[PDB]
Chains A and B, each alone.
Chain A
Amino acid sequence: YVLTQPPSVSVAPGKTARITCGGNNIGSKSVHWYQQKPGQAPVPVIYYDSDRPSGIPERFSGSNSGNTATLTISRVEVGDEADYYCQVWDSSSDRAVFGGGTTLTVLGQPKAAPSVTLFPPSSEELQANKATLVCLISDFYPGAVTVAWKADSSPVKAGVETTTPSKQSNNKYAASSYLSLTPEQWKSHRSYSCQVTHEGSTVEKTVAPTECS
């Protein structure tokens, strides 16, 4: 048995969001909808067509008829950013078939400015004959991160690792960048700079090889 879901659905706040789960003669089976918020275990919002488990707000409704199921979310809030799966138990071969997920992105959400903080390598790391720059990003909620590194103005591209930005419970996303280099380079250039470009806005932090006694 094969199930079909739209890859992504976007609705404006306060409206009703509709997710469709296709299938051949799906009206002769029971469809269960699960939501999975990032970094969490899935929980059921509706099971057995339209029944609602305890604790689920009445904004969720479900319908099953013909060849398509339907999950309806009334008055879509911002805390509804999750992946939605439809499950059907095929009893002919005694198995359970899941969907493919359907991200629900809520429009609006005014753009935020990412916060960047850089940490100089510590002493014990220096005695380990290695140096790391830990340019760290903070809250923002467009999907875009571009990190550039400079050493006294000259761009540097050598052993730079950047993770893909990830969604946060607070919607605002998070990201990090790592720069590995030998202590010889770190005790040679007069300064280092990490900048993030964010829809034109450039936020940069500079650190110099200076330490107290």
Chain B
Amino acid sequence: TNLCPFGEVFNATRFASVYAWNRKRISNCVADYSVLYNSASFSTFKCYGVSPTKLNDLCFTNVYADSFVIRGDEVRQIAPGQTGKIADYNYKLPDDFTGCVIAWNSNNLDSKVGGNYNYLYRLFRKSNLKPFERDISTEIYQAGSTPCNGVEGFNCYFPLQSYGFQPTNGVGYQPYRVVVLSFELLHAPATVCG
């Protein structure tokens, strides 16, 4: 009958990188999504299946909350059936997605004069991720036929790449914090609703 922490997933001080997106499991809840929808601060609030009005009056076994920070123009790639950097190599959603995607600008918190390089993203990979797959390996990427043994140089690049966050960037270039909710149903008494 207690309120589980939507504050520790939305108002957390520091967010994880996109290639290492944070996942939290939410169970045994009474949940009021009305304040979430009426916050009037999210630049993007969209989801698929359940109507954005009927989340509270429907019961789920448990929820998964993923959080990360990406570029603004890349927020479009967080959707089922997408392609690109994030949708292929970093964070991929299944076609039959159910949860809701929320995204808001965080320029005042994640951007500094000179360049904020703490956030990384994967750039080179042999294949595409399966849905909900996380890869944090930092093995060297071999593009050519030369079997380089962990040396960065000719035809061998470090897969992870940093991005510079400036206060002078365009609105589509500025950092955006993204939270994705996924409700799942199994042979469970559906403890999460209210």
A28 CB contact (under 8 Å) in B48, B76, B81, B95: B48
A89 CB contact (under 8 Å) in B52, B81, B95: B81
- For residue A183, CB closer than 8 A to chain B, the reply is no
A-B contact count (CB 8 A): 19
- For residue B7, CB closer than 8 A to chain A, the reply is no
Task: List B contacts of A89 (CB < 8 A).
Answer: 81
Query: Number of residues in B with C-beta < 8 Å to the partner?
Result: 11
Task: List B contacts of A28 (CB < 8 A).
Answer: 47-49
**Contact B46–A49 (Cβ < 8 Å):** yes
A residues 45-88 near B (Cβ < 8 Å) are: 48-49, 66
Measured between alpha carbons, how far is A30 from B81 in the docked complex, in Å? 12
**Contact B76–A91 (Cβ < 8 Å):** no
- For residue B80, CB closer than 8 A to chain A, the reply is yes
- For residue A211, CB closer than 8 A to chain B, the reply is no
Q: How large is the interface on A (under 10, 10 to 19, 20 to 34, 35 or more residues)?
A: 10 to 19
Q: Mark A10-36, 1 if CB is under 8 A from B, else 0.
A: 000000000000000001111000000
**Contact A91–B47 (Cβ < 8 Å):** no
A91 CB contact (under 8 Å) in B46, B51, B52, B95: B95
B residues 86-114 near A (Cβ < 8 Å) are: 95
Measured between alpha carbons, how far is A30 from B79 in the docked complex, in Å? 10
CB distance from A133 to the nearest CB of B (A): 57
- The SS class assigned to the B binding surface is loop
Task: List A contacts of B47 (CB < 8 A).
Answer: 28
Closest A residue to B95 by beta carbon equals A91
Measured between alpha carbons, how far is A49 from B95 in the docked complex, in Å? 20
Task: List A contacts of B81 (CB < 8 A).
Answer: 89, 91-92, 94
**Contact B76–A48 (Cβ < 8 Å):** yes
CB distance from A87 to the nearest CB of B (A): 14
Closest A residue to B47 by beta carbon equals A28
Measured between alpha carbons, how far is A66 from B46 in the docked complex, in Å? 12
**Contact B95–A92 (Cβ < 8 Å):** yes
Task: List B contacts of A91 (CB < 8 A).
Answer: 79-81, 95
CB distance from A89 to the nearest CB of B (A): 7
Task: List B contacts of A29 (CB < 8 A).
Answer: 48
User: Which of A29, A48, A91 has most chain B Cβ within 10 Å?
Assistant: A91
Measured between alpha carbons, how far is A91 from B76 in the docked complex, in Å? 14
Task: List A contacts of B46 (CB < 8 A).
Answer: 30, 49
CB distance from B81 to the nearest CB of A (A): 3
B residues 13-47 near A (Cβ < 8 Å) are: 46-47
**Contact B51–A27 (Cβ < 8 Å):** yes
Extra contacts, 8 of them, besides A30-B46, A91-B79 (Cβ < 8 A), are A28-B48, A48-B76, A49-B46, A66-B51, A91-B80, A91-B81, A91-B95, A94-B81
B residues touching A (Cβ–Cβ < 8 Å)? 46-49, 51-52, 76, 79-81, 95
